[PDB]
Amino acid sequence: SGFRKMAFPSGKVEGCMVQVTCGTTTLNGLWLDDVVYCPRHVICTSEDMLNPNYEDLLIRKSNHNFLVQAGNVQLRVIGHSMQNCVLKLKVDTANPKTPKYKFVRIQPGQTFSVLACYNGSPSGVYQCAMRPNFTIKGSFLNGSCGSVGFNIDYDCVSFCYMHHMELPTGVHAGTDLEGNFYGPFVDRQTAQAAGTDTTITVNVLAWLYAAVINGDRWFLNRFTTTLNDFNLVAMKYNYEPLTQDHVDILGPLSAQTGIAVLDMCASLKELLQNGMNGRTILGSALLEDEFTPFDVVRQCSGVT
Amino acid sequence: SGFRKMAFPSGKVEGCMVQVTCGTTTLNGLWLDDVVYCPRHVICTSEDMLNPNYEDLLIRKSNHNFLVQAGNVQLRVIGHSMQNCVLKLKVDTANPKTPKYKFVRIQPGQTFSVLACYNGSPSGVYQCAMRPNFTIKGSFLNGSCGSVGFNIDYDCVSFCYMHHMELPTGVHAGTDLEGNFYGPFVDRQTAQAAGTDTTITVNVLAWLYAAVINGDRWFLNRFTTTLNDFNLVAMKYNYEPLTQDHVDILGPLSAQTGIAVLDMCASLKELLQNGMNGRTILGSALLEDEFTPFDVVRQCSGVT
Ligand SMILES: CC(=O)NCCc1c[nH]c2ccc(F)cc12
Ligand SMILES: CC(=O)NCCc1c[nH]c2ccc(F)cc12
């Protein structure tokens, strides 16, 4: 029993983190096989960041201009290329600690672990979600760029995020490991505004299921609803619309608890309309939306 | 910017986790040097748990009755002893991945990371606090016993907790790595009740400082208070008394933000008396007390 915001164990990713320096700029890189992946803005002066032409700035860079350090040992860079907003640095040594891995581009509402690093050194791990506006709410100081987001399926690390920037509002934007930004963000020091940060409805429902499983039942009501009726209320409260795909995904939690998905929807509807009235659910005074249905099943079943 | 509930990177502890089996009971062990540490209740049938005499149950156990598996390789047990509520199993192989380490007994209010394991395999990491009633609110299913709590100072893992049991209320109790329970709990399947789970005041104040540093300032008020006046309000709201030691500990956050500790106390006092009025602080609708002053400094300064 008990339900915690839980990151993946980080060791497999710790063994991939390196320091990348280009001139006076130091940030983090991800060393998989004989490639180091890092934000392309590693080549920029904070002067360059105002309006960078990456292709033009890259012409002024050779292999030897990229200093890659893994622990306190320098890696030899034998190649570099720009793919979208990341640099791939070919090094002469395959990372001996390379785990089984994939690059995945996640959808909004998907959760992942972040290993926050500075100078190629891990400082902490926490659980995030890709927000519906394609931001994440992280904890990232100067030097944390190139810190990565990941999921683990048994022994395979799926890398889904690399950190590139803070928006003026203090929320975070980054790329997949092919260097494509989540959302409409660009690696330029220009005022960029996020859209509406809506609540990830399917995740709130997963977490209400988690609460019932852990004995927090006070919010269970005598009502049901329909997807259309629920969605009218969702829209009004800046919740993402619930689809039949979301209902299907919640089916195992429905089965485990014997609470029909639409019944839990009606309970959530009353929570939106009535508020918490000073009560808590799993130690939270607000509806948590950074657990996926898969996360709730995993934590409630004890997958390793 | 951004402030996250952040665990220590877990790799150093992942390399210490083993499976311990005694008969039909499997749980987790911690392999440091040539010793495996695990809950002594590994020797019990759930029948034994109702009223175990550990010394008597141990007479029926030899070295070869303790099956220790590290990955999919068996370790040879060459010795066993009971220290308080843990077993120390001497094995013939020093853990090659043993990190620099200490055993520390933490005080209530101290935070630590837990690597939740099943069958000696890490499933997740999360941040806990030792509650003032010497419980923790974890996420622990059957098979998670022997999962450990830890802090990291650069390259030295301080082990502070080993998981032993759930109370009937679904909160958690365990030992330090010398096998001494936190609080008055015993490794027996008998109804045990926790005392008052009071709020860790110094930690709430640290987290309010974290909020000011991250631009969440709406709750900053025009008042100050005294320790005695604040404490009267604290007592009434089941908050731990604030000592001058707590004020000293908050001094660096006071300095960084230019908000006198007693001023932040007066802001907290008004938050207790007035509530949040539907507002959030660092994305929370309740006052977070599972960050220490040290945690706030670490995360806000980016220590690795
Ligand atoms: C807070 C703010 O001004 N954000 C605008 C984007 C921005 C500023 N500095 C950067 C450095 C690297 C990068 F890729 C993007 C940026
Ligand atoms: C929920 C509940 O009944 N808790 C009482 C203690 C208890 C039950 N099962 C156990 C197994 C091992 C152990 F060390 C303690 C216990």
From Swiss-Prot, chains A, B:
Subunit structure: 3CL-PRO exists as monomer and homodimer. Only the homodimer shows catalytic activity. Interacts with host FBXO22; this interaction promotes the proteasomal degradation of nsp5.
Covalent cross-link (Glycyl lysine isopeptide (Lys-Gly) (interchain with G-Cter in ubiquitin)), residues: 5, 90
Protein name: 3C-like proteinase nsp5
Free-text activity regulation comment from the record: Inhibited by pyridone-containing alpha-ketoamides compounds 13a and 13b. In turn, alpha-ketoamide 13b (tert-butyl (1-((S)-1-(((S)-4-(benzylamino)-3,4-dioxo-1-((S)-2-oxopyrrolidin-3-yl)butan-2-yl)amino)-3-cyclopropyl-1-oxopropan-2-yl)-2-oxo-1,2-dihydropyridin-3-yl)carbamate) inhibits SARS-CoV-2 replication in human lung cells. Inhibited ex vivo by michael acceptor inhibitor N3. Inhibited ex vivo by compound 11a and 11b.
Species assigned in the record: Severe acute respiratory syndrome coronavirus 2 (2019-nCoV)
Record: active site: 41, 145
Localization terms from the record: Host cytoplasm; Host Golgi apparatus; Host nucleus
Lineage of the species this protein comes from: Viruses, Riboviria, Orthornavirae, Pisuviricota, Pisoniviricetes
Residues shown, of full length: 3264 to 3567 of 7096
Domain Peptidase C30 as annotated: residue spans: 1-304
Function: Cleaves the C-terminus of replicase polyprotein at 11 sites. Recognizes substrates containing the core sequence [ILMVF]-Q-|-[SGACN]. Cleaves and inactivates human TRMT1, preventing tRNA guanine(26)-dimethylation of tRNAs. May cleave human NLRP1 in lung epithelial cells, thereby activating the NLRP1 inflammasome pathway. May cleave human GSDMD, triggering alternative GSDME-mediated epithelial cell death upon activation of the NLRP1 inflammasome, which may enhance the release interleukins 1B, 6, 16 and 18. Also able to bind an ADP-ribose-1''-phosphate (ADRP).
Catalytic function, reaction form: TSAVLQ-|-SGFRK-NH2 and SGVTFQ-|-GKFKK the two peptides corresponding to the two self-cleavage sites of the SARS 3C-like proteinase are the two most reactive peptide substrates. The enzyme exhibits a strong preference for substrates containing Gln at P1 position and Leu at P2 position
Cytoplasmic side: 1-304
Source taxon at top rank: Viruses
Record annotation: effect of changing residue 142 to A: Does not affect ability to cleave and inactivate human TRMT1
